[PDB]
Scaffold this active site. Structure first.
Site, PDB file in Angstrom:
ATOM      1  N   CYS A 106       0.841  -1.193   0.000  1.00 51.76           N
ATOM      2  CA  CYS A 106       0.000   0.000   0.000  1.00 51.76           C
ATOM      3  C   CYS A 106       0.881   1.250   0.000  1.00 51.76           C
ATOM      4  O   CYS A 106       1.639   1.479   0.949  1.00 51.76           O
ATOM      5  CB  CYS A 106      -0.959   0.006   1.197  1.00 51.76           C
ATOM      6  SG  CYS A 106      -1.979   1.522   1.323  1.00 51.76           S
ATOM      7  N   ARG A 109       0.066   4.772   2.728  1.00 48.65           N
ATOM      8  CA  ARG A 109       0.140   4.636   4.175  1.00 48.65           C
ATOM      9  C   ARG A 109       0.519   5.921   4.912  1.00 48.65           C
ATOM     10  O   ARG A 109       0.494   5.915   6.144  1.00 48.65           O
ATOM     11  CB  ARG A 109       1.117   3.514   4.555  1.00 48.65           C
ATOM     12  CG  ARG A 109       0.579   2.114   4.261  1.00 48.65           C
ATOM     13  CD  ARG A 109       1.626   1.030   4.509  1.00 48.65           C
ATOM     14  NE  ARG A 109       2.665   1.038   3.483  1.00 48.65           N
ATOM     15  CZ  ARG A 109       3.724   0.233   3.483  1.00 48.65           C
ATOM     16  NH1 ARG A 109       3.869  -0.658   4.456  1.00 48.65           N
ATOM     17  NH2 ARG A 109       4.627   0.310   2.509  1.00 48.65           N
ATOM     18  N   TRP A 278      -9.389   5.983  -0.749  1.00 46.83           N
ATOM     19  CA  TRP A 278      -9.698   6.723  -1.964  1.00 46.83           C
ATOM     20  C   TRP A 278      -8.701   6.306  -3.032  1.00 46.83           C
ATOM     21  O   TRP A 278      -7.633   5.766  -2.726  1.00 46.83           O
ATOM     22  CB  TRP A 278      -9.689   8.244  -1.746  1.00 46.83           C
ATOM     23  CG  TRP A 278      -8.440   8.841  -1.165  1.00 46.83           C
ATOM     24  CD1 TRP A 278      -7.251   9.075  -1.816  1.00 46.83           C
ATOM     25  CD2 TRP A 278      -8.263   9.326   0.170  1.00 46.83           C
ATOM     26  NE1 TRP A 278      -6.344   9.657  -0.958  1.00 46.83           N
ATOM     27  CE2 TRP A 278      -6.938   9.813   0.269  1.00 46.83           C
ATOM     28  CE3 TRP A 278      -9.087   9.373   1.299  1.00 46.83           C
ATOM     29  CZ2 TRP A 278      -6.429  10.347   1.448  1.00 46.83           C
ATOM     30  CZ3 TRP A 278      -8.579   9.906   2.467  1.00 46.83           C
ATOM     31  CH2 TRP A 278      -7.267  10.389   2.534  1.00 46.83           C
ATOM     32  N   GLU A 283      -4.601   3.552 -10.745  1.00 43.33           N
ATOM     33  CA  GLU A 283      -5.408   2.348 -10.538  1.00 43.33           C
ATOM     34  C   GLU A 283      -6.606   2.308 -11.478  1.00 43.33           C
ATOM     35  O   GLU A 283      -6.949   1.244 -12.012  1.00 43.33           O
ATOM     36  CB  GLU A 283      -5.923   2.272  -9.100  1.00 43.33           C
ATOM     37  CG  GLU A 283      -4.880   2.265  -8.009  1.00 43.33           C
ATOM     38  CD  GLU A 283      -5.512   2.058  -6.635  1.00 43.33           C
ATOM     39  OE1 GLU A 283      -5.782   0.896  -6.268  1.00 43.33           O
ATOM     40  OE2 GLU A 283      -5.764   3.060  -5.933  1.00 43.33           O
TER      41      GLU A 283
END
Ligand code: HEM
Ligand code: HEM
Ligand code: OUP
Ligand code: OUP
Ligand code: H4B
Ligand code: H4B
Ligand code: CL
Ligand code: CL
Ligand code: GD
Ligand code: GD
Ligand code: ZN
Lengths: 402, 403
Positions: A106, A109, A278, A283
């Site tokens: 991720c 973070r 969000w 992506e």
């Protein structure tokens, strides 16, 4: 013992001392690296509980005595009699944040301290799950000013079944086949769509039909649940200067909310604990719309741009992909929906790395998933060596329930 | 119980059985992956490595376990006894050089591995003769722009005598002149080699695209400076097919990528001087060499010239500028009739290599983070391919700078 880590853009050196605490061994050996694989292939419960509890009290400057001593005893007693234990709510909050903080893949973070934990541990039925999920979606979407949230359902216990959301996300677009086997809609969601039909749902016409949830409480078959159309916030895609882009009729939903990973805290396993934040624009723009095995729009946008698709050296793929990403960013901003570009996101992840160096002595990060899927070496993470390893609490993948 | 490897664009599944033969060890453990590190880093051990190479060569010619194969093994063991080392036959050196290319995990070009011209310079005896072999390499490999892959292999390391070393990291490089305000004029990656050249007696230029001299070291000799003939070094002025102001940037790049500071290892023997060359992938020039902040760093200048909005990241000005910089590299090299491959064609041929290699050896060492290009990664098919990274020998290896 302590890996040396260099940034090749600056020249700076750090040492990952936190790697030493790693546990649930990964897939690599001194003979061969499997870092690129997507999936790495009663008296122990207590040990993972003691470890998690001592984490909590270090974090609140409270290691060494009072309720630290006491809280260690009650879990000892609780597992001794019941063979499980219940987390204090502040612990469940603390464990949720750490699991996000420990997620190697991720890039978002920098936000790990701002997370809203909805305690659904007193959940009892599938109709109850659906009401929780809707509070989550509503709160998380927040009219498009998006807010990170997780909802934690009851910790699986032996002898009793499992709470499990069947969809991989809450908002997913169906994918329907054809005489040609070829999909209309999203090809990643072909299986869950055929399971939804095979459970009562009525398949629609188009590419962007929002799937119905398949929610399942212990020892019961799944139960369909239609989503409130006003609660599924979507963004239609337009481009700031290519007037025809809107007429391609592309859309994407606002809330990325992953509902099939297993949250593990202190030795307890939460098979249903959906979390959301969000989107990062790449992506949507690059993976979901441009992957050949997703919506695969790349050649269609290239024709509209009058690009030469006959030879790869015109970089027509790269021109179209950039513009698709521009259209995502523009459309989300025009709709007042929180979105972040890969440059902003990666630059904040660097800042996260520096923060986590002074705090915990390093940060587990998976290079191949932090680096954006377009323009990698133009973001700072590309030039940054990273160390990947598993800490707890953690989010884990888990087999599908069929 | 060998790694399962999945392609996610298509659904293919393979098992990498070649990785069980991995002749050394890398930096990863079950506790922590260090794949993203740039540097992952005795007669009986020389014998067991040589025995392994001799076995490879004799498989490749379909003579395994034969009389010639056993004779050769006895010969090597006998020569390690009498002298502490052995000599490769000519054909064995050609095969070993091709396998080192074939085995290099971070090379996306290996579809070509069998087309390699091997210049045997193991009789070289001075730096002056080193220079001559190198000029011939450059001339043959450049080929007036129709580039050919080659390696020139100088004498192996051996006890009693120092090494042949090429001090320059590549055969063609541009100077980087330190300055004040601390800025660099030219290529900042070459600041150190540029000073060594001047301190070993080179009159420096002051441009941004000044070709460095060669610093060549004979055994137990100080390095010696050689200027390359200007007409041996083929270069490409960079222009853009539609942005005409681009040509006014004055940018250039050279035709031949010839890496000269790596060590070639075969059968336990080490060749610290064995420069090798192929042709460029456009992203190495366009994205890395020109857009890295710590290299020529032209991204912002290009973007302003393009009238992009550089005040905010969400316009994707960096992405748009970098794409056009790559277009310009490809356009210029094709205009000048100089071989070049774009990241799409290169990565597609690597996918064919992976299939060729799976059928032939049961796998292929590949470093995903280096195989995937630095722009448009998931637009290329290697992004969606899982890879297993491991070290086979023969091999090219990093080695420390001789200064
Ligand atoms: C708030 C903004 C956020 C952004 C921009 C973001 C971004 C991302 C991205 C780009 C990925 C890569 C996945 C892929 O490309 O397939 C990812 C994975 C992931 N994210 Fe985040 N995310 C955010 C919030 C969160 C939250 C709220 C959580 C948990 C509470 C979380 C935990 C994870 C996890 C567990 C993964 C799976 C990767 C792994 O195996 O570690 N993220 N995220
Ligand atoms: C013929 C065209 C060739 C192309 C297009 C090509 C392409 C590439 C690229 C793009 C890289 C990574 C550099 C970077 O991105 O920073 C690389 C690395 C490398 N290449 Fe190739 N190459 C070619 C020929 C050769 C030849 C002829 C050799 C040796 C005889 C070779 C051996 C290597 C090695 C040793 C590395 C470093 C690998 C490592 O450190 O694991 N390549 N190549
Ligand atoms: C909270 C959040 C925000 C955000 N912006 N993005 C997120 C992306 C993921 C995510 C994690 C793993 C994934 O991959 C699993 C592979 C098995 C099938 C695919 C994928 C999709 N690849 C997405 C999870 C959470 C995200
Ligand atoms: C024959 C050839 C052709 C080509 N087209 N490209 C090539 C690129 C390299 C190469 C090797 C290592 C590198 O880096 C190593 C790190 C240690 C210091 C930097 C780089 C630059 N990244 C390039 C080597 C040979 C190449
Ligand atoms: C095979 C390869 O590891 C796989 O395609 C990975 C690469 N990196 C990724 N990175 C992100 N963020 N998401 C992904 O799905 C992938 N896919
Ligand atoms: C630190 C980081 O891993 C490093 O910059 C690597 C990443 N991948 C790369 N890949 C290629 N092909 N070339 C490179 O120089 C790099 N750099
Ligand atoms: Cl998604
Ligand atoms: Cl280069
Ligand atoms: Gd038109
Ligand atoms: Gd023009
Ligand atoms: Zn690894």
């Amino acid at each position: 013992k302590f890996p040396r880590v260099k940034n090749w853009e600056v020249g700076s050196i750090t040492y990952d001392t936190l790697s030493a605490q790693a546990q649930q061994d990964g897939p690599c050996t001194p003979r061969r690296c499997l870092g690129s694989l997507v999936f790495p292939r009663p008296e122990q419960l207590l040990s993972q509980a003691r470890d998690f509890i001592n984490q909590y009290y270090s974090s609140i400057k409270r290691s060494g005595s009072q309720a630290h001593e006491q809280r260690l005893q009650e879990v000892e007693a609780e597992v001794a009699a019941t063979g499980t234990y219940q987390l204090r709510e502040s612990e469940l909050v603390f464990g949720a944040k750490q699991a996000w903080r420990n997620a190697p893949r991720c890039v978002g973070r920098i936000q790990w301290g701002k997370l809203q934990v909805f305690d659904a541990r007193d959940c009892r039925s599938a109709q109850e799950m659906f009401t929780y999920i809707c509070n989550h979606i509503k709160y998380a979407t927040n009219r498009g000013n998006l807010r990170s949230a997780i909802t934690v359902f009851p910790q699986r216990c032996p002898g009793r079944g499992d709470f499990r959301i069947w969809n991989s996300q809450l908002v997913r677009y169906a994918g329907y086949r054809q005489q040609d086997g070829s999909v209309r809609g999203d090809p990643a969601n072909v299986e869950i769509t055929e399971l939804c039909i095979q459970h009562g749902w009525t398949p629609g016409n188009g590419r962007f039909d929002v799937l119905p949830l398949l929610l399942q409480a212990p020892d019961e078959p799944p139960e369909l649940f239609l989503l409130p159309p006003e609660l599924v916030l979507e963004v239609p895609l337009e481009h700031p200067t290519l007037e025809w882009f809107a007429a391609l009729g592309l859309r994407w939903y606002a809330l990325p909310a992953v509902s099939n990973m297993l949250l593990e805290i202190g030795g307890l396993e939460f098979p249903a604990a959906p979390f959301s934040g969000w989107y990062m624009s790449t992506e949507i723009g690059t993976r979901n719309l441009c992957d050949p095995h997703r919506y695969n729009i790349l050649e269609d946008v290239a024709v509209c741009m009058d690009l030469d698709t006959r030879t790869t050296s015109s970089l027509w793929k790269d021109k179209a992909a950039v513009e698709i990403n521009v259209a995502v960013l523009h459309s989300y901003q025009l709709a007042k929906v929180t979105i972040v570009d890969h440059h902003a996101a990666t630059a904040s992840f660097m800042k996260h790395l520096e923060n986590e160096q002074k705090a915990r002595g390093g940060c587990p990060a998976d290079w191949a998933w932090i680096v954006p899927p377009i323009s990698g070496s133009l973001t700072p993470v590309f030039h940054q060596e990273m160390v990947n390893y598993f800490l707890s609490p953690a989010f884990r993948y888990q087999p599908d329930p069929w």
